């Protein structure tokens, strides 16, 4: 499963 | 009181650690940040919990690893994400990860076990100092590569959409442009890889284009059951 992308800065 | 001796956080799309509670952080303490998905559809997410001050994964130490799933199917970048880390007073970790919309959530709680050694604590905190430089250019890489794939993706689902829109001429430039950012993307040349996505933009700009007029012409003029 992929990891988390960064949803901001 | 009691500090937490060095930094919690999440592996990021790259290979990449986030951290979510700073090293000398009094316990019991809470810490949240928030996510989002990478592809069209994704419904769910790996939570790698690490432990460690430098930038990859591979220099910091492993934790524990579980999934959020049930995600809404939304466009990548559309699910919100929260990740809340929580640390009690006798040191038990608590990672909760929760999506916005729908509260669908996953969480665990790993007990304090063999620890580190004060010594191998000391090293990793002297190890982050002495390789900083590097950590920060490796990092700036592995954020390259990861908008190529962010773009790539972004250009697979318009494929998929919209094919009808190119020729098998044009098709020809751009699955080309796409392919050497894909090729360049796996190697070590942070200005190339940036070259390479420029490349891809500037070979698809027409394509998007041609996707909003379609967009357009439809909403403002209307639909034809043609086409």
Request: aromatic fraction near 2%.
């Amino acid at each position: 499963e992929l990891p988390p992308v960064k949803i901001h800065c | 009181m009691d500090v937490i001796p060095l930094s919690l956080g999440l592996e990021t799309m790259g290979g990449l650690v986030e951290k979510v509670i700073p090293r000398n952080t009094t316990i019991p303490v809470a810490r949240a940040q928030d996510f989002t998905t990478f592809k069209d559809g994704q419904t769910a997410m790996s939570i790698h919990v690490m432990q460690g001050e430098r930038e990859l994964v591979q220099d910091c130490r492993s934790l524990a690893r579980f999934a959020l799933r049930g995600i809404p199917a939304l466009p990548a970048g559309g699910a919100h994400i929260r990740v809340t880390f929580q640390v009690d007073a006798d040191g038990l970790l608590s990672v909760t990860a929760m999506e916005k919309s729908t509260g669908v959530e996953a969480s665990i709680q790993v007990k304090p076990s063999y620890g580190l050694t004060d010594s191998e604590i000391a090293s990793m905190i002297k190890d982050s100092m002495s390789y900083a430089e590097q950590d920060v250019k490796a990092r700036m890489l592995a954020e390259q590569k990861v908008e190529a794939a962010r773009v790539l993706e972004s250009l697979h689902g318009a494929l998929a959409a919209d094919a009808a829109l190119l020729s098998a001429a044009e098709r020809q430039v751009i699955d080309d442009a796409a392919a050497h950012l894909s090729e360049v993307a796996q190697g070590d040349d942070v200005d190339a890889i940036e070259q390479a996505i420029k490349n891809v933009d500037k070979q698809t700009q027409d394509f998007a284009a041609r996707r909003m007029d379609q967009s357009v012409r439809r909403a403002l003029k209307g639909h034809s059951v043609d086409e």
